[PDB]
Symmetry: D3
Subunit: 133 residues, 6 copies
Amino acid sequence: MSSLVRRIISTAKAPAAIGPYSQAVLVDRTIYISGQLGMDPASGQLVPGGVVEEAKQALTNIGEILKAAGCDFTNVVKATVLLADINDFSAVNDVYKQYFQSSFPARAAYQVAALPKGGRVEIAAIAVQGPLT
Amino acid sequence: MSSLVRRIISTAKAPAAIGPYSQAVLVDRTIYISGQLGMDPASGQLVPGGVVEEAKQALTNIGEILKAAGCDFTNVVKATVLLADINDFSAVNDVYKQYFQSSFPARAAYQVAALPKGGRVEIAAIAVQGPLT
Amino acid sequence: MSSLVRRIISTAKAPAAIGPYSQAVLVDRTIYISGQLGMDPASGQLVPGGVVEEAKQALTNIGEILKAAGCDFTNVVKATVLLADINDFSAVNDVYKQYFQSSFPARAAYQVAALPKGGRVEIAAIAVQGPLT
Amino acid sequence: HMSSLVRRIISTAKAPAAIGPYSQAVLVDRTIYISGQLGMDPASGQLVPGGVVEEAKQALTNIGEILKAAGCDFTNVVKATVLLADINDFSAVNDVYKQYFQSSFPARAAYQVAALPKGGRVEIAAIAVQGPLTTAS
Amino acid sequence: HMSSLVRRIISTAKAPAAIGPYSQAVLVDRTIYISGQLGMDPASGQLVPGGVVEEAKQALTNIGEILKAAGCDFTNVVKATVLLADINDFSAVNDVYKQYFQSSFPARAAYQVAALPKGGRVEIAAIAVQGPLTTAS
Amino acid sequence: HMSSLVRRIISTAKAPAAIGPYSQAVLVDRTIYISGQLGMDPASGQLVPGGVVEEAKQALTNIGEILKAAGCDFTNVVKATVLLADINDFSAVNDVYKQYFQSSFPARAAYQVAALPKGGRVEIAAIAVQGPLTTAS
């Protein structure tokens, strides 16, 4: 009946919350990361340029949340890729692969009906705090 | 190679199953909670009044499942909010915030094409059994 | 600050990856399984026959990934069932129940706008490596 | 940061009280460290009469009450230490000790010491692990 | 496969150096096994003068420096062993030992031995658990 | 409820058999408690001839076989106890013991006792932790 560590992860290097959620929660060694839209952290607005630029921004935001938790992309074990349009699958895959360079996470990827703020992509993730063997 | 505790959480204070699933599963210290529609526990029928009343009922149902597992809303670490209509985002956020009063979970929220029983909202969650520090 | 085990699960008894993901990731004792379409493992093509045959194939694929990790369906604690059409709920439930014969997982099930490859169903899961009590 | 592990000080009236800055036992995480027990009567404060066999019986009774206070029994013991005033009493003490265990026997340290507190002829200490335990050998 | 647990060899200059194939203490996972400490002056390499009370004070100072090197203090000690050259010195040594603990006291082993290294009159060893710890009793 | 932790009773024919209600070693969770080993020949049932140095070599051989039966080697030992019939034999025994360890040395207890079983001149016990272990100091 040990008391397990639970910590809210919060960094100004990622966007402010637009609803009642934390950027991520660390509990024991597992980090649950909220869905990230392609919002610029300074302004909270979706970056221009459509799905490719939004995907890059979403992943960069995930990277800053990971870093705040003492992690990097190699600590990610599962990701969820929500698309506004299934036709963008190939383009989003090519962006995604540039960040998750090895030990590729488990994943689910599919088209939803609509995302907050009219986003074209939103990515959530689960990570495990290192060290990992 | 310890044998980890796995327990099916089941309470008549939450709706009966409408498919082949458990209300929640506790494994080690993590509790995976099934998606809850706004069904009345006694009748299994969706409450009238649309998305706001359904969201309240769904969250109340989650609360009873948490309580059966010796938890409350403060043990939730991640939630998924599935909407039938993205226009309801603000209204559902305001209901949601009334239950998750602190240590806000990580979250993903988005519009799907359709929910079972024609629900307007469905909420799933992950919690960690306390004590948490 | 122990170093936790993280292992990529990979078996030729399940389909090759069609994107930048692992079939599953084992970390500590938790196994995150990627969404499985009803693809034949040998060819990578969706099996004919629609949602019922695809659901059977998806679940068989999950079973082979579990087996590669020293597990079976009784180790599953949470599943996500993504449908291309909510009208298929009853048919998919009846297939699903044939594999998850006891200790039914927690679950969320709902209709999405579109799945990769035009699939009619996709199933992801979380399992915990045994022994479980 | 790290998890906060549970510690319980065990203190039962059915075993001799721990006079001074020690405890009968300390449970930390799942491991229970049990202080050495003499053949002391909990209600007299000195040794039971009759010598080493009588003292061994009382010491093991005392350990059993401390185990029960920690939610354990003798099946949870993983290591014991048997200290003797006379090595030649080992067989007699072992004939008492063997009655408390049926299988999956603890590891053991046993030897004669120069002197025990209270003039004792035997003192038994133990380490136990809180269950459930699965024995695979 | 299993997780890789952390092990740290503790080696502080504020306690007597561990001459030869032993360490002052070993931390493994959360548990710290501390070698028996004599009343040795870290900078002389032999016992402090003045007998058992002076030696007990120095031994406990030495243990405290090893605990600090492992990120602990005396509140993390869960079991201690007090070895004596003379059982009749127990009360005097206990009056020193009690100053180092205020509550949640360790389990204890204590007895007279035939001989300690270096002609010591007291030697104290300990097991501690790295915090945080929550004491529920 | 709590997880069920693994316990294995270790019982190898390459070390002297544990006669009576004790085991050569008990593994529980990741920790192995190894009973004190004398310089006993596994196939004779009594001490090897030649005195303390010969007995120390045989005792350490016996411990090594018990470690191997638990899937460990001497690098997994975190604490050892060296009991002697004569404190003046410590250096000779240490010259044997040092051959079994190369670094990350165990914590140690060592002292002379009034009598060991079987008339032994040395008895070595140990605590080990099943690997993998990462040593960070």
